Design an enzyme around this catalytic site. Sequence first.
Site, PDB file in Angstrom:
ATOM      1  CG  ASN A 149      -1.829   0.780   1.074  1.00 63.82           C
ATOM      2  OD1 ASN A 149      -1.675   2.087   0.615  1.00 63.82           O
ATOM      3  ND2 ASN A 149      -3.154   0.503   1.434  1.00 63.82           N
ATOM      4  CG  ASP A 150       2.738   2.512  -3.581  1.00 64.61           C
ATOM      5  OD1 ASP A 150       4.053   2.125  -3.284  1.00 64.61           O
ATOM      6  OD2 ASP A 150       2.570   2.401  -4.921  1.00 64.61           O
TER       7      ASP A 150
END
Lengths: 811, 811
Positions: B482-483
């Site tokens: 999850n950037d």
Amino acid sequence: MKFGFFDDANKEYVITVPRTPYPWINYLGTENFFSLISNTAGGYCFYRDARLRRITRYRYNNVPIDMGGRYFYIYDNGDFWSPGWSPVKRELESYECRHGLGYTKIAGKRNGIKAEVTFFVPLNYNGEVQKLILKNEGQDKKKITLFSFIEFCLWNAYDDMTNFQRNFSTGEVEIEGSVIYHKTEYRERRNHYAFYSVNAKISGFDSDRDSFIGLYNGFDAPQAVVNGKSNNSVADGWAPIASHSIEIELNPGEQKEYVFIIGYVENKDEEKWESKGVINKKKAYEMIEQFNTVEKVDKAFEELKSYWNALLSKYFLESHDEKLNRMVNIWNQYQCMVTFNMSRSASYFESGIGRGMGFRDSNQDLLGFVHQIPERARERLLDLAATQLEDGSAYHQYQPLTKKGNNEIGSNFNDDPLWLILATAAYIKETGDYSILKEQVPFNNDPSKADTMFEHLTRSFYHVVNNLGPHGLPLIGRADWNDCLNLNCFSTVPDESFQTTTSKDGKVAESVMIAGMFVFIGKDYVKLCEYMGLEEEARKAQQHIDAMKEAILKYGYDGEWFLRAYDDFGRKVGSKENEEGKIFIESQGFCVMAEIGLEDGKALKALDSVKKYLDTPYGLVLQNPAFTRYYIEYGEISTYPPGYKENAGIFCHNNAWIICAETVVGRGDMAFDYYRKIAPAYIEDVSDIHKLEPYVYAQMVAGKDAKRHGEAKNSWLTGTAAWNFVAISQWILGVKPDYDGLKIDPCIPKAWDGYKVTRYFRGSTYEITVKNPNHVSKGVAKITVDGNEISGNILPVFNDGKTHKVEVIMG
Amino acid sequence: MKFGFFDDANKEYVITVPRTPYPWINYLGTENFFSLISNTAGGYCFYRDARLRRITRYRYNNVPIDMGGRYFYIYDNGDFWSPGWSPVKRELESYECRHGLGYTKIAGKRNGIKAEVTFFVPLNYNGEVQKLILKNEGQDKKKITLFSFIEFCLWNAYDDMTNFQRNFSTGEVEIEGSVIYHKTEYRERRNHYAFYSVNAKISGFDSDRDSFIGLYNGFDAPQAVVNGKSNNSVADGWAPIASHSIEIELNPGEQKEYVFIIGYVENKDEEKWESKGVINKKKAYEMIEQFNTVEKVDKAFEELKSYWNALLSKYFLESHDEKLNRMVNIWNQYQCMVTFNMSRSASYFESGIGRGMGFRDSNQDLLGFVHQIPERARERLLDLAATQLEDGSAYHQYQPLTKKGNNEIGSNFNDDPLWLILATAAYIKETGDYSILKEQVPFNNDPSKADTMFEHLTRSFYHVVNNLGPHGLPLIGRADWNDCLNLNCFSTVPDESFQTTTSKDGKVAESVMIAGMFVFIGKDYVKLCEYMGLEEEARKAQQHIDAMKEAILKYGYDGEWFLRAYDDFGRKVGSKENEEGKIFIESQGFCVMAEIGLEDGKALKALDSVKKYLDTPYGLVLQNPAFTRYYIEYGEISTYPPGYKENAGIFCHNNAWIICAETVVGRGDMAFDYYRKIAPAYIEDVSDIHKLEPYVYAQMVAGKDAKRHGEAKNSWLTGTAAWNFVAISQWILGVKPDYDGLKIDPCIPKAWDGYKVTRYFRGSTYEITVKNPNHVSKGVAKITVDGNEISGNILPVFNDGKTHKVEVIMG
């Protein structure tokens, strides 16, 4: 065709057809909020920084051109059209755009309805005010619907045009009353939002682009306008916009008036929210109420006019040439304000993405601006000096928003530091404010490295001294004033700009132009040393100057003109011995301005060579002959096709240096010929060739080697404005600020009987009447001030708030 | 609610109206030359790198949408129109676009003239071929003029859209015969040029946009077309284009055929020039020669079709559900080829500027691609590993053109390294080719630092071990998969992306997701240690895995689901204790896939919690509840409005993990239900809401928290394709490559009687017929291969080029 004309009395350019050879624009604002607006109301606005606080969206290089801006639509029984012709492009009965000083008036009329909109940014106010008058000039009762429209940008213009994977889901608005709020990212790190308000009850609105326009429709025919009613869309990602609609009835002869405002608001963190997820509008309400009546607007509009009248009155020319008067008293000065604010950042050519405030560009803009508002010029100098590094070099430009220097368009331009000395001198000569030399100024934008402004000056001067090549000429580094002369580059990779590709720390390549600058500008540093009571430093400085002069005379003169440079192989550039680029213009200007070869005829020879090899109907080209292939040793300059940009294009900026130089050798006639050839007021009837704005200078005109010879690029944002105003106001007209006061020393066309210059200077104003009864070009026989004759060419400083009569006799 | 339909026989999606809810595109090319093309022929093409070698220009987020592409105008006695309707947008008698495998076929008819264009990139060819057929279906003889049109891009797409200051003076072209060449900057550093040819004599051409279109006109009405004849313009700066015109006469029932080619050419440094200033066209002649008859064009077209039939034949399903058949047999596998080639670089949402080939993204794409072209898969792995640094971390992405790693979109994503192990294992399970482990692979794109592919995997694995937090869970770093989960950021400045803004080397924040991945993926690292004959290293690795499995149970389980993370302050993320974001989807998936809590009801409970709080008719949202304000301690995830992207959006990619997990606890009915909620073929009858391509997966669907719940964003380029293909083909349908052979282990809806998968695997074909007489979800009771009962669930490896029949009875 004929596209418009000058209106001197109202200080406006009047455009009479919408389809100009290219969109013709004007700039709104002079402090913090700015707008670019074309003759069809195209363009956009932003707060301080066109890359990081862009408020409305605009597409450069679009098809059709200039689609997007402030778009009013008049809906009249199924028919619809815009006051600016575009975007709908239905024929108007009448059309007119007036570009004035800080405002733009666009007026259109169709089927008995006349719409007239005045766009402007009031002094000390963060918004673009738009006064729309609507009159029924027909005989019947009319029921119409008025639509407004702007398209928002998502603040960061770069992210806005590339990061759709994210930013199609971030768009947020609030609608309340007659106001539409764009609040994208306010929920997070942004403390600012924008609004679009009208000062009347609205019939409808839209804030989602797809809903108002329709996915497969253009600005020419938004589905909501076509159907004659808003859709009251609430934006949720995609593309937020602001559109009001107002159903209006008008009796014959009746008119109604509206005020629209595009505003910008920054909240203190303790005043961000009214409630959860609801933005604090306290400051918006205030801004909006401030202009909720046409009469409040008019008052501000007149306050702006008086503001301009004051600025302009500081240099007032009365002469027998109306074209000259028009340039000197209005447009050149106006353009100088714009360039001072914008530098080279945002126009219809500069995209407002990559360029901030240029170091050398803003230093030079100061030259033609210091007399208008000394206070702001003072602070500007301090802001530029702070981006100077400890070794005396400087960040090539800084971010307008933060004022932090950065390397985004390159580094190691060895002419940069000298410009700071010239600009400081100019400010000091203009004001007598030597206290600027004592101000503590950061280095590297680092408060902990601060030293005096004079010490910044010292490191500029000595950055040249400490960086000389094999001939004792200044090393060029990445490039000098000419960004495209890259002698340490040798690039073969197509993907990196020459401005940022690696450039070695070469100890061979030198610039004769920087050498000229050094001698010219060094004069000023020596005097400043003397002021600081540093006699020995002044002496050593003068020695370095004297040695540089001998270096130019010995290794910088080609025989009939000054050389340009030496490349990394120690080969000449700008010599008769080269196959191409036999003569360049840049070194001719500065070397002669520095007063080199005045006695042995070398200067006169150079200027005659310039005339012979570089002169054209549209101005002096950069060099001759043009380069006809890529030279890995010369860099970007040879990558342009012949006649465009730095490759034998006409760079109006450096034409000013030749004008100045002609003045040095006393040829007023030639100097003025050069000035006339590129000055807007003299070349207006060729707009179909020039293509760009006829009321402002541009950077580049295609040269004699180009098929499009005479066609301009990059209008408005150019150092041509500052430098040409200096040339005409100080070198030709001869009203020249100096440390001890006003130096009078004209150099004019012999045929001139005389003229009058009214000059505000150091707390009092001087009425200067020039008389040329023997019709000479240069030389003053007699000066008398207040009735009494004086000795010398330096007027005294009064600072008494009175007006002083001055008579000057040419002889 | 439907704008087209699936055509299984011809492997195409047929679009029957031009105004789709959003332009719906296809991709041409599988090797080096690539095109994006919408249903109205919009889009553009590039060579290898959409940022550095963009051939034709395209405007994103345009008004109207999707203006610019390959635009044929039919001029018929004053009337004019386009086969794709757009851009002229005059009503057609009939319209139809078929998007096929590597070609797009577009057909329009107006006033008795039918035009059909087929666009495709042939195998092993650097150009887009356009076969155009014109036919008179009316009663009388017709005189018409056919125009072609493309707009060139100036190679570097970033420069192209920002640097007008310079690039309005660089445009250059050559015209020779029926060919227009775009050669901007070829005179300098570029060794490449593009061309646009037609295989017939032409009546006229245009190469300047302003001449063809006219300043104030649009693609909808180019002044030249309106006028019925080319202006024969030769570009010189501004905006180069390529346009042919051909006057044609057609008797009733007669049809003519033309072949147009958009080509790309590269010459060796020493062969650039035919003569001074004239480009070497030798290679272009050959490319044009190659397809100068319709006969040649049809042969390559059929060869492309054979290519695609062979690719798809390696995994071929027969079942009673034709929606599932078309997904597995055609569309999912087609999309996996596209993502393999394009990663997340260029679509109608990804701008082809900022993103190259993602490290994490391309490793995952391999999972769904290895069976298609193992050879190309093998090489992709080596390129990826080369961008790994010596410490085991990796560049987040690399430039397609040069394959060099870079930091353009951030660094220090601690999940990155593990994906390399998964993908390498997938490759080996597919091919049995362990030789890849011995390939010498550089570190940091530096050959002198090379070492074996296995050692690269070792450092991937130990990067996690050497970077654990206070609970023995993996330090998260800048972010995990999850950037937007940025726990070391604490950003307050709106001007910089969370992806790149400074992020401390935090030693507190931990990811339970990376923990889950490390256990799941670590199992492969152990297997490979064993194969390398390193039993003790296998033992040590197993220890670390077991220690991580304990840490998850001790500190990673919240009571009814797995925790998400621990923030920089040591506080739980994704816990019932939190106000918002009480449960996250990512850790549920990987922990259960890692086989944690199968025995004590924890896995099942977690999955039930997922169902209860994250489920929707459109798929599973990222977390719940959504974030309703910015949490500076969490970073970018709370910056989106609720229901969009990482803030409780439906990220289809991570739904696949839940599908796999459901498979692990033996709930095939739930797994398939989830699968169906997001599979294009199963939601086609809700096209209007989904909005984007009904034949490919999209990255994100707005969540239950969004007013646009159901509407997709970022279609085509997404890991959803590979992961969902893996889910259905391997985890549900049960055909799973393993180290020693094909493993058969289906987990399916109990009601299914059976199905048949034909799988090509290690040199042999297996026809696998699955039977479910007892109606169980999971569990194989018996397998026969070639009529003989085998023991266990691994099929033997034959590698004999023969077809082997396999019967599987579940029970």
